[PDB]
């Protein structure tokens, strides 16, 4: 199978250096251009630059020239992107992608075409915050709404279930928002018969936090 495998998610502090990787399998890595593309949270796709691993010829968007270094190790079919000094605004999903070619067998590829193979993305989060478990507060109530406010944690994600997974109809768990404090917050709600008047199960893997809060 033709694939690009990217390195795992990274949570870093500003100023730190970071190198992420993109490993090709199932094709001649040195015969195709590799591009890097950024997607900031909630935004569109932005092209950062490209490299031809066969000779390490590189081009950078003016917006990223001098902020990142793109490189390749052809001996192990891996391309890299490296920051010397991460900024908070580098928080984004980063994709590597291969450019299409009809015939890879000709030695000179010509300019980079459309991206036909995409890596699965590497999430990079840059923040001065430290790992911190959530505080969980109840959202107290024919139909009644109730919920849990999961506040002030870092980094993403938390998972939320209701009644240990037995209660799934009518549940809405909202996307986290980043607060100006630099910590995240989300809420999870469920609607239930007002006649039945409930425990939300919050897990935050980074802090090893588990909280089961009764909402009365």
């Amino acid at each position: 199978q033709v694939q690009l495998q990217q390195s795992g998610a990274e949570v870093k502090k500003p100023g730190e250096s970071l190198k992420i990787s993109c490993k090709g399998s199932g094709y001649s890595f040195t015969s195709y251009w590799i591009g890097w593309v950024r997607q900031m949270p909630g935004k569109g796709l932005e092209w950062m630059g490209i490299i031809y691993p066969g000779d390490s010829d590189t081009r950078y968007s003016p917006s990223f020239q001098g902020q990142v270094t793109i490189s390749a190790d052809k001996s192990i079919s891996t391309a890299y992107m490296q920051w010397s000094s991460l900024k908070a605004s580098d928080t984004a999903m980063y994709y590597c992608a291969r450019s299409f070619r009809d015939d890879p067998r000709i030695a000179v590829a010509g300019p980079a075409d459309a991206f036909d193979i995409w890596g699965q993305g590497t999430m990079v989060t840059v923040s001065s915050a430290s790992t911190k478990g959530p505080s969980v507060f109840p959202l107290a109530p024919p139909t009644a709404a109730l919920g849990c406010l999961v506040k002030d944690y870092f980094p993403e994600p938390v998972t939320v279930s209701w009644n240990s997974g037995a209660l799934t109809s009518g549940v809405h768990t909202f996307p986290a928002v980043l607060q100006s404090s630099g910590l995240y917050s989300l809420s999870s709600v469920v609607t239930v018969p007002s006649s039945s008047l409930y425990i939300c199960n919050v897990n935050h893997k980074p802090s090893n936090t588990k909280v089961d809060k009764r909402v009365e």
């Binding site: 591009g35 593309v37 569109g44 796709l45 932005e46 092209w47 081009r59 968007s61 003016p62 917006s63 994709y95 992608a97 299409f100 300019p111 980079a112 075409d113 459309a114 991206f115 036909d116 995409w118 890596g119 699965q120 993305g121 505080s135 507060f137 109840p138 959202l139 107290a140 139909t143 709404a145 919920g147 406010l149 506040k151 809405h172 909202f174 996307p175 986290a176 928002v177 607060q179 917050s185 989300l186 809420s187 709600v189 609607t191």
Partner: protein, 210 residues
């Protein structure tokens, strides 16, 4: 080169013929690609060189060009096709993408059910107060929430979050959180969120006294 997509969102139904457009600010020849992306997943290439169908992509996708205007057509929309679509020019460096067109599932108007939640006394012992307004199972996505603290419009101190279209009923839900210092929270009486939505004849207000 600026790539502009239109419309920004499109609501359609399974079996619809849909077209979405991409205009380049100058000639890009035919070096135009179209991509599909689903939430949290990597893009997938659909069309390259303006009209060439990527191997393995169903032929219900087609691309065409008229000058600087490029069109992506889906001839019969299927459930897998609801997604965001991006165009990209690769005529000249830097390569640039359109801002995306989200294709969503059309359904009938549904007014939101609105709920307001005061801060818990647990949280008040912490120094901050979070007031939460829930807009449940509504359609279309466009809604507005305004926070009212003793009749004074709030600005800059709320954040909101929206779910993706519900897998079963194609509605949206939204939560807005008003954040106040507990000092400011103590100094006022009435807290209200005011909800405006196409499904509502007039704005709905849920409120409480501290």
């Amino acid at each position: 080169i600026q790539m502009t997509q239109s419309p920004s969102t499109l609501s359609a139904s399974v079996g619809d013929r849909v077209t979405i457009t991409c205009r380049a600010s100058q000639s890009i020849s035919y070096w135009l690609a179209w991509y599909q992306q689903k939430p949290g997943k990597a893009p997938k290439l659909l069309i390259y060189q303006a009209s060439s169908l990527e191997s393995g992509v169903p032929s219900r996708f087609s691309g065409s060009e008229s000058g600087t205007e490029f069109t992506l057509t889906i001839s019969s929309l299927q459930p897998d096709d609801f997604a965001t679509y991006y165009c990209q020019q690769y005529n000249s460096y830097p390569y640039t993408f359109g801002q995306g067109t989200k294709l969503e599932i059309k359904r009938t108007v549904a007014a939101p059910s609105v709920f307001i939640f005061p801060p818990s006394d647990e949280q008040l012992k912490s120094g901050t107060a979070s007031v939460v307004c829930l807009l449940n199972n509504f359609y279309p996505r466009e809604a507005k929430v305004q926070w009212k603290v003793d009749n004074a419009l709030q600005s800059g101190n709320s954040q909101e979050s929206v779910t993706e279209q519900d897998s079963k009923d194609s509605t949206y839900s939204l939560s807005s959180t008003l954040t106040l210092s507990k000092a400011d929270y103590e100094k006022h009486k009435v807290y209200a969120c005011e909800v405006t939505h196409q499904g509502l004849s007039s704005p709905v207000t849920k409120s409480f006294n501290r």
